[PDB]
Amino acid sequence: MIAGSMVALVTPFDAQGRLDWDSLAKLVDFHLQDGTNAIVAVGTTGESATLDVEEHIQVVRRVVDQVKGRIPVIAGTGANSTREAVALTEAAKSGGADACLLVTPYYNKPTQEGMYQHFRHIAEAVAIPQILYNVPGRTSCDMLPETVERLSKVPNIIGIKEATGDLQRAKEVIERVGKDFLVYSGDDATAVELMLLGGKGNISVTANVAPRAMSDLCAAAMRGDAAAARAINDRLMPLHKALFIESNPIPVKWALHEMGLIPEGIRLPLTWLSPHCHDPLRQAMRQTGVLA
Amino acid sequence: MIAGSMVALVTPFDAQGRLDWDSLAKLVDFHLQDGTNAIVAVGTTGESATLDVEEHIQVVRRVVDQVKGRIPVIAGTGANSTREAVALTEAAKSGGADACLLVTPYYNKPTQEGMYQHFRHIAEAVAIPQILYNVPGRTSCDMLPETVERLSKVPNIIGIKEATGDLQRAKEVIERVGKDFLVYSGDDATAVELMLLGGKGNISVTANVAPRAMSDLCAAAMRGDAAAARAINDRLMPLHKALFIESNPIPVKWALHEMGLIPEGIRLPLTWLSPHCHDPLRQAMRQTGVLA
Numbered sequence: 214m215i216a217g218s219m220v221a222l223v224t225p226f227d228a229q230g231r232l233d234w235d236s237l238a239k240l241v242d243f244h245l246q247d248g249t250n251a252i253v254a255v256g257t258t259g260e261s262a263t264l265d266v267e268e269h270i271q272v273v274r275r276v277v278d279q280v281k282g283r284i285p286v287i288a289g290t291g292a293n294s295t296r297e298a299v300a301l302t303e304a305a306k307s308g309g310a311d312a313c314l315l316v317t318p319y320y321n322k323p324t325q326e327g328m329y330q331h332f333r334h335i336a337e338a339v340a341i342p343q344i345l346y347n348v349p350g351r352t353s354c355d356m357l358p359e360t361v362e363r364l365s366k367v368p369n370i371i372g373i374k375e376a377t378g379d380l381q382r383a384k385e386v387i388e389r390v391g392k393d394f395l396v397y398s399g400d401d402a403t404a405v406e407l408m409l410l411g412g413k414g415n416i417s418v419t420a421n422v423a424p425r426a427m428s429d430l431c432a433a434a435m436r437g438d439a440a441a442a443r444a445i446n447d448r449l450m451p452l453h454k455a456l457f458i459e460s461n462p463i464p465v466k467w468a469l470h471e472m473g474l475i476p477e478g479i480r481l482p483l484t485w486l487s488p489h490c491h492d493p494l495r496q497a498m499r500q501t502g503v504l505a
Numbered sequence: 506m507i508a509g510s511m512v513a514l515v516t517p518f519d520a521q522g523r524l525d526w527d528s529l530a531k532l533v534d535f536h537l538q539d540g541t542n543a544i545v546a547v548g549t550t551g552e553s554a555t556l557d558v559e560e561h562i563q564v565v566r567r568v569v570d571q572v573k574g575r576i577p578v579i580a581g582t583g584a585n586s587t588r589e590a591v592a593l594t595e596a597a598k599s600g601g602a603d604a605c606l607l608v609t610p611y612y613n614k615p616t617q618e619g620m621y622q623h624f625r626h627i628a629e630a631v632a633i634p635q636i637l638y639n640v641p642g643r644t645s646c647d648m649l650p651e652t653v654e655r656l657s658k659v660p661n662i663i664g665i666k667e668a669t670g671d672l673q674r675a676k677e678v679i680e681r682v683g684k685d686f687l688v689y690s691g692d693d694a695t696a697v698e699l700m701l702l703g704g705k706g707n708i709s710v711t712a713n714v715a716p717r718a719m720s721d722l723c724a725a726a727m728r729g730d731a732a733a734a735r736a737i738n739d740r741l742m743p744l745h746k747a748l749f750i751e752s753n754p755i756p757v758k759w760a761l762h763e764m765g766l767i768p769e770g771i772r773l774p775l776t777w778l779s780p781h782c783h784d785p786l787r788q789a790m791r792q793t794g795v796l797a
């Protein structure tokens with residue numbers, strides 16, 4: 214049952230960088246207890262780039278075991294190599310994950326046709342629901358609406374995460390794919406509209422620090438309650454902007470730490486929120502009420 | 506020993522997509538015999554994205570072993586995780602490569618400070634020349650001249666592959682670094698210009714199909730022979746264009762196959778040159794004399 218507020222869960226590390234299993238458990242209880250509908254473990258925010266193939270599935274395994282069915286658990290499995298996406302995706306299934314989120318290829322700029330037979334292959338090679346992921350801002354390629362529609366017809370491809378933040382884009386994708394095809398938001402700031410457009414959720418970074426609030430806003434958004442959604446949103450907006458004052462998840466982790474939920478750990482090349490951006494974020498957290 | 510025409514060598518595959526050592530052998534004799542200054546193996550064009558770790562060094566070892574050290578062999582080792590880049594850089598050294606090429610981190614968008622810590626650590630961890638590589642059109646990030654200057658003072662960071670195609674940029678970096686840090690072009694179209702400015706070579710893609718002519722061009726350009734370098738360039742210009750009709754190395758492998766040098770094998774998400782581009786590339790090839 215995959216829709217609503219879906220925290221793009223961070224992967225906590227201790228001061229020396231080793232996975233801190235204690236923080237992960239608490240964070241899972243945290244979202245488990247404050248309304249979160251789903252959890253995306255090992256995604257862009259959970260630092261998928263810098264995890265061992267071994268670390269990858271251990272994080273997917275530990276969350277799945279804790280959640281125990283109460284919520285869906287979506288595993289990040291995209292890769293710029295089809296064979297490597299198969300491996301990760303198969304490793305997520307034989308792990309318990311409820312579904313896989315697969316970003317489009319990143320460095321090597323495939324053709325639209327290539328992205329088609331890329332996801333189509335994985336969807337055929339692994340018997341697990343897969344969710345497309347578009348974010349050209351990171352991966353220097355863009356999966357046009359025509360190609361989304363072709364993939365929507367494929368049997369295991371249940372939905373897509375649209376992160377461009379462009380609302381004419383969601384509109385177009387939504388007006389071409391079935392009622393079965395779930396469109397999710399990957400841009401917190403404009404998620405409310407995507408949902409009012411027919412969107413079925415928001416894979417959020419903001420949910421990491423304001424879980425109860427994000428589920429309320431997705432609820433209202435998907436309920437047709439356009440008044441309430443904005444009301445919350447405009448309250449949360451300053452947090453939406455601050456959390457990206459530096460490439461995500463650098464900021465969201467600083468906050469998580471300032472709340473006392475995770476150690477100060479992050480893997481290279483990533484760095485810790487540089488000095489200059491500390492009060493901008495803290496005021497956003499204080500003004501929004503997630504801190505003190 | 507590292508400058509001039511530096512073929513960004515393709516990794517030949519058979520029709521099933523396995524390694525074709527026989528084609529690789531030939532290719533090496535081809536650049537070896539036609540004036541190629543240096544060979545870059547397993548880089549962007551060599552489809553680094555879709556090779557095992559075991560394929561990575563095998564290819565390198567083979568090239569190094571054939572070259573018998575008469576020419577420099579540079580291995581692609583960059584990765585979006587500093588631990589992986591260390592590993593990949595260790596494989597290459599303990600593989601005989603004369604130097605390694607390291608593209609900036611790609612999907613994770615590290616801060617300028619992060620990129621410095623990134624390359625500074627690899628330069629420390631592995632005793633082998635390290636060349637940087639900046640190309641935002643793929644990595645969704647860009648390493649500023651200021652950050653190049655910092656990494657330039659690092660003991661075994663010997664140069665940078667500037668691939669923006671922005672000449673004002675190259676001027677800025679040449680103008681900031683010691684006469685011992687070398688700037689190479691990453692854009693075939695404007696390579697002649699970069700060298701004239703003070704650059705020391707082209708990690709060329711064109712050189713894949715026109716080696717002799719490429720090293721003639723780089724030689725002139727590094728001499729100071731402006732008139733001659735730009736004449737050979739406008740003659741090649743339509744080839745520089747055709748080789749990018751679709752994302753590299755799709756177009757180039759085609760040519761390579763049309764010349765009878767490699768089989769028709771490419772790894773997903775990569776596709777074979779789509780039908781519409783066959784005759785534009787065959788003409789540009791024939792129009793330039795690589796083909797007859």
Ligand SMILES: N[C@@H](CCCC[NH3+])C(=O)O
Binds near residue numbers: 267269585
């Ligand atoms: N096993 C790591 C691989 C990192 C390499 C990223 N291209 C992951 O979870 O993605």
Ligand SMILES: N[C@@H](CCCC[NH3+])C(=O)O
Binds near residue numbers: 479482
């Ligand atoms: N202080 C380092 C973190 C090193 C820990 C190991 N990845 C940084 O933010 O760059």
Ligand SMILES: N[C@@H](CCCC[NH3+])C(=O)O
Binds near residue numbers: 293557558584
């Ligand atoms: N697909 C892997 C390749 C690693 C092995 C060497 N090419 C990556 O991008 O991290």
